[PDB]
Design a protein around this nucleic acid. Structure first.
Ligand SMILES: *C(=O)[C@@H](N)Cc1ccccc1
Lengths: 134, 427
RNA sequence: CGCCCGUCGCUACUACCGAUUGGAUGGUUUAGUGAGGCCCUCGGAUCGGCCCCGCCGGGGUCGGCCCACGGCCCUGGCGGAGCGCUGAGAAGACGGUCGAACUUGACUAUCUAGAGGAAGUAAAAGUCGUAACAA
RNA sequence: UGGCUUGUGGCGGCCAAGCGUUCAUAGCGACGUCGCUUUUUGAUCCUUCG
RNA sequence: GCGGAUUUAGCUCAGUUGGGAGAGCGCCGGUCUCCAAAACCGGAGGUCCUGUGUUCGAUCCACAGAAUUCGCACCA
RNA sequence: ACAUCCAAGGAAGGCAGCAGGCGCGCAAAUUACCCACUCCCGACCCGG
RNA sequence: CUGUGGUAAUUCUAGAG
RNA sequence: CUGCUCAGUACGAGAGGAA
RNA sequence: UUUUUUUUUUUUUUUUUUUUUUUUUUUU
């Protein structure tokens, strides 16, 4: 009963072995991405580049490199809807957000951790269906 | 006391800004200490003779070059009227600015140099006495006073023969434009000396007409169409500490009050009036003729620009998917066909527009069709044509709101044609 | 006719190394300098009261028919007006502790530029050899 | 060092087929030919090792 | 607002001094195959971004627009 | 250390108090009405 | 607190009762 | 050599810019 | 008392892109 401190100290230190716990523990989340841990960042379409799918899946994926506002850093982004390219023009303000928990992109996608959802401060769904905007 | 908008027009260097500045001065609207400082600054930069002009010309490039570049607005008050006076540039590069000025005007002072060669140049084929007169007519200015300027100049020296020469030339041309020439004052002045600006000049005994101020009082105020729907073409948009983003422009039709919700077309952005100002005096309402700045809550400066038009939400300004017009061709070096794309200067806007069809050539005097779908038009022709603006443009039918329904066509920096819109297909 | 390995040639992205004694940033600071208030040795623009003398006005007593007059006590006005003594009292000023800020460097914490060098990872297949799985 | 000579170097020159959009010379000139030059370099052995 | 660049084939770029364009991918097409890869044929493909001026003639020059870029100005 | 207007001489300021502008960003309002309530502050009222 | 004052200008402020 | 007036002038369609 | 047993590799590196298809009670 008098050896409480060792178990107390032991737990916290052995705990370091949990990588997600570790992630919160080290100021890394703030600095591991262009966002700074942020869910959404406004950006500019520097170029639009077609890319090739990975493994047996064969496809041309719509990809945009984006210059961020406060951050000012290069970003690799994924264009989502079918003919969004028709509606994506260079240097139009774009809001970007991530896919399924931070880390790995959709298995089909190559090196993109980010998704494009707004064009000119307008959501994607509106351009995509005829009834909304044009 | 009724309010009027005055545009000052005419060829480069003919004396527009010197007239306005000097007029404001001897009318005591300008601090003598400031005139003193301007003069010293003008002399020290090698430009003594710009002291009155520099009351209006404030931009770094205006002062460096000694020319006006864009509009300046000044309030002054005569015996009968309060005027907003608008100083417009003569330089050919900035006739687009002069045109927005004319679109906002009730009357015009045409300033024309009597100096040898200066007159002839202004009235030459590619001169801006010629061009500004033409554009003022098309933007719907009927009341005009002409200041035959620089009578003091040594190569002029108050000569009545020179004066009557410029008057007659000016008269023959102005009558060909449709001006009622018998009614318009031709005052011999010196913008620089002051002759005939506000008091009568001993140097020119032979002149019996009004002085310029007297001529102003003899003008007549225009119809105030307060029962037509609100339309305010924006001439510029400022971003102002305390107010936020404030469009400026002249109320053409309708009325605007603090509290109002307003929409700006063609963007489709909506805001709400926090405040209204004319010549630094805060207002609660503004009616046609009011030249104003209006602060707008909920609108970013980047959303709105010059040539956009503000109306109330229930009757928003019309955006033309396409539009139809009656046009006359002033000048063209070859021919105009379907597909021709000059810029359209309408109210404060200027947007290239493609001629998608030429429905009919008309006899310029009678208006009868002389040929269905002509193969082309040329200089001298009149026509009914269809127009598709290259980017979203606001226009109204001339029959409905004439101040958003008259236009010039310009291309390669020349005025090519003039027009009135006879029909609009809304976006 | 199964799996499978590594160097070598493209293309991209990370991180390691790095001539510039490298640049940038923010915290604690050694030393040399020191505004400014404040305590404190002074000073002393200035102001008033009593000191002495002479002259008149007024109240109360004494020597005079007086009246002026003289003495005491209390005020008013003028000269030696400040000439003798006292009190509070602005500028300034001795020497201080406090201590901004300047410079000169330190030092951490936090990023970062670069010819080149060196891995990897996307990695499907081009090119060399058979290492591992069945002694 | 100096020196003859000037191939080599440097510079002008007659002629004008060409450039120069029309045209040769405004401004330039193939080829071909006449030369001036002695701060390059070259060949020569004349002056200087007493 | 002003001023510079840039716009040429499906893609990316070269030309030019007004007589009218040229290459690397592409890629695309066919044969073989489940489909490609390889192999073997075959493909030619452009209002030279637009209007006007000049000109006998404008991809080119001049003057004017658009779109993208980059300087600079303005500052309710 | 910021930084506002300079009659060229000077004079100011500390909105991390309401409103309101900008900025910053992924991220938070309006230049309103009032002492009636709750209290509090000044002296024997009833001011603020 | 009366009145009398100066300055581009500031919470400037004299002298007199 | 530079400045002030000469002068934003004449000459220019402007860009510009003198003596 | 009853058993070995020699032989030994003389010669076998490599094989371009892509590969594929699955789901249930209740009796008439
Ligand atoms: C804001 O000042 C307007 N109301 C007046 C104005 C100033 C500058 C430019 C345009 C308008």
């Amino acid at each position: 009963l008098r050896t409480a401190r060792k178990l107390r100290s032991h737990r916290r230190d052995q705990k370091w072995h949990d990588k997600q716990y570790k992630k919160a523990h080290l100021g890394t989340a703030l600095k591991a991405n262009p966002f700074g841990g942020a869910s959404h960042a406004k950006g500019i379409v520097l170029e639009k580049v077609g890319v090739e799918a990975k493994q047996p899946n064969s496809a041309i994926r719509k990809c945009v490199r984006v210059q961020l506002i406060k951050n000012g850093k290069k970003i690799t982004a994924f264009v989502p809807n079918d003919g969004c390219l028709n509606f994506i023009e260079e240097n139009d303000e774009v809001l970007v957000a991530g896919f399924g928990r931070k880390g790995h992109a959709v298995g089909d996608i190559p090196g993109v951790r980010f998704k494009v959802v707004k064009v000119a401060n307008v959501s994607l769904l509106a351009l995509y269906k005829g009834k909304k905007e044009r | 006391k009724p309010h009027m908008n005055l545009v000052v027009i005419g060829h480069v260097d003919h004396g527009k800004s010197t007239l306005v500045g000097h007029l404001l001065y001897r009318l005591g609207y300008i601090e003598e200490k400031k005139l003193k400082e301007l003069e010293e600054q003008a002399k020290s930069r090698g430009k003594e003779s710009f002291k009155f002009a520099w009351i209006l010309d404030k931009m770094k490039e205006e002062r460096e070059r000694g020319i006006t570049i864009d509009l300046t607005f000044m309030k002054f008050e005569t015996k009968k009227y309060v005027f907003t006076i608008i100083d417009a540039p003569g330089h050919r590069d900035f006739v687009k600015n002069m045109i927005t000025g004319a679109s906002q005007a009730d009357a015009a002072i045409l300033v024309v140099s009597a100096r040898k060669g200066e007159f002839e140049a202004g009235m030459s084929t590619e001169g801006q006495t010629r061009e500004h007169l033409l554009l003022a007519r098309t933007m719907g200015i009927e009341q005009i006073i002409v200041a035959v300027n620089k009578m003091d100049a040594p190569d002029v020296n108050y000569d009545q023969k020179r004066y009557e020469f410029v008057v007659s030339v000016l008269k023959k041309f102005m009558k060909g434009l449709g001006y009622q020439v018998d009614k318009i004052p031709f005052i011999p002045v010196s913008a620089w000396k002051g002759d005939n600006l506000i008091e009568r000049s001993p140097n020119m005994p032979w002149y019996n007409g009004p002085t310029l101020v007297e001529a102003l009082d003899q003008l007549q105020p225009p119809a105030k169409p307060v029962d037509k729907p609100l339309r305010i073409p924006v001439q510029n948009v400022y971003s102002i500490p305390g107010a936020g983003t404030v469009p400026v422009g002249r109320v053409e039709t309708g009325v605007l009050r603090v509290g109002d919700k307003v929409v700006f077309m063609p963007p489709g952005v909506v805001g709400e009036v926090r405040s209204i100002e004319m010549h630094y005096q805060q207002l609660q309402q503004a009616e046609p003729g009011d030249n104003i700045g209006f602060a707008v809550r909920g609108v970013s400066k980047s959303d709105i620009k010059r040539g956009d038009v503000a109306g109330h939400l229930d009757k928003p300004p019309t955006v033309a998917e396409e539009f139809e017009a009656r046009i006359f061709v002033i000048w063209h070096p070859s021919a105009i066909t379907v597909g021709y794309t000059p810029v359209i200067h309408v109210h404060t806007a200027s947007v290239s527009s493609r001629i998608i069809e030429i429905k009919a050539k008309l006899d310029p005097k009678t208006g009868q069709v002389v040929e269905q779908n002509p193969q082309f038009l040329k200089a001298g022709d009149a026509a009914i044509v269809r127009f598709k603006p290259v980017k979203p443009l606001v226009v109204e039918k001339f029959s409905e709101i004439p101040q958003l329904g008259r236009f010039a066509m310009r291309d390669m920096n020349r005025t090519v044609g003039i027009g009135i819109v006879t029909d609009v297909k809304p976006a």
